[PDB]
Write a protein that binds this ligand. Structure first.
Ligand SMILES: *[C@@]1(=O)C(=O)N([C][C]C2=[C][C]=[C][C]=[C]2)C2=[C][C]=C(F)[C]=C21
Ligand SMILES: *[C@@]1(=O)C(=O)N([C][C]C2=[C][C]=[C][C]=[C]2)C2=[C][C]=C(F)[C]=C21
Ligand SMILES: [Cl-]
Ligand SMILES: [Cl-]
Lengths: 187, 187
């Protein structure tokens, strides 16, 4: 049976960090739900790209649980994720059930906000390090992608393909990740 | 004064190849118009990401001309661009006025369809080479980004950052491209 991904899309999300994982995961045969934090309406991303979510978060939650919950970055998107009681509940449920959580750029700071995966080795965007490390709840890494058990983190738009393919490898295996990678013309 | 970019968005466009250049160009302070080929309505991309264009092509044309016209790939998106009389007219005008034209993945095959930039060195996605080379109107390159004067081409999702930054360098210079690049966490 196919694996399922929930991508939580908030105003101010980094659109590259949203679209790259959604696209790459669909290439891998993952069933991806782009879920709007604020409802069903189109979402204005950080660089003004407007994306129409597949569903509201409220609705997508009802079709859970998911094999991965994906948190894009963007400072303002991550703040919105960080402030959301609905995200808190989703992430706590996912952690509790030992499901994967993946977050990129400023996205990992939402893990801090919601007290998720304390003790993990994580990375973030370099500019988000101090926020992530407030209280020393995680151990910091400069790896482009960091995976510490069920906590998978990455750094920025330029690591989005690696992040996405790490998600694919985690859910569908190395061979599928390699197959999906080759047509992308990655360096 | 700020440079201006027209990104032509058709059904079946590769969403990564659309969003990466739009975002990176906006980071560079370029005024970018995402123009829907079919009108003002949301566009269903190749991997089902739905993007709301800033304007119809019809409307965006009226605010021309642009310092660059950008053609994303995706096989079906490129076919739609290739079949469009409106795109033909836009590209001929751009070529005639010696403005930049940039196309990625299968996007360059629209240049062939509309008889644009014959004689140029070009690249495409590897799977789009034979289509592009039908009649030997161009010279083929395996460079990740190829720029032959005002014809700028690239290969796939994995070359989208390089493609975008090449556009930025062409319009705004090497120093701006370097400044925009550094926060992206590119390899
Ligand atoms: C990335 O998508 C993101 O989340 N970034 C924000 C990092 C940050 C900046 C200031 C304070 C806290 C966090 C970010 C920045 C730059 C970039 F290119 C991508 C991203
Ligand atoms: C890319 O975005 C694109 O346009 N691709 C289509 C290439 C092509 C395939 C078959 C026949 C003609 C052209 C393509 C393919 C794979 C990929 F990963 C990205 C793109
Ligand atoms: Cl940001
Ligand atoms: Cl395609």
């Amino acid at each position: 049976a196919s694996k399922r991904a929930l991508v939580i899309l908030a105003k101010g999300a980094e659109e590259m960090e949203t679209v790259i994982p959604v696209d790459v995961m669909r290439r891998a045969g993952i069933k991806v739900t782009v879920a709007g934090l604020a409802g069903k309406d189109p979402v204005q991303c950080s660089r003004d790209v407007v994306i129409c979510p597949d569903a509201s978060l409220e609705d997508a939650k009802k079709e859970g649980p998911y094999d991965v919950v994906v948190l894009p970055g963007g400072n303002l998107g991550a703040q919105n994720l960080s402030e959301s009681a609905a995200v808190k509940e989703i992430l706590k449920e996912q952690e509790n059930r030992k499901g994967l959580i993946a977050a990129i750029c400023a996205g990992p700071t939402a893990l801090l906000a919601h007290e998720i995966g304390f003790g993990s080795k994580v990375t973030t965007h370099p500019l988000a390090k101090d926020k992530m490390m407030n209280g020393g709840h995680y151990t910091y890494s400069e790896n482009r992608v960091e995976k510490d058990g069920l906590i998978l983190t990455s750094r920025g738009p330029g690591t989005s393909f690696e992040f996405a393919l790490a998600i694919v490898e985690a859910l569908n295996g190395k061979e599928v990740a390699a197959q999906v990678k080759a047509p992308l013309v990655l360096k």
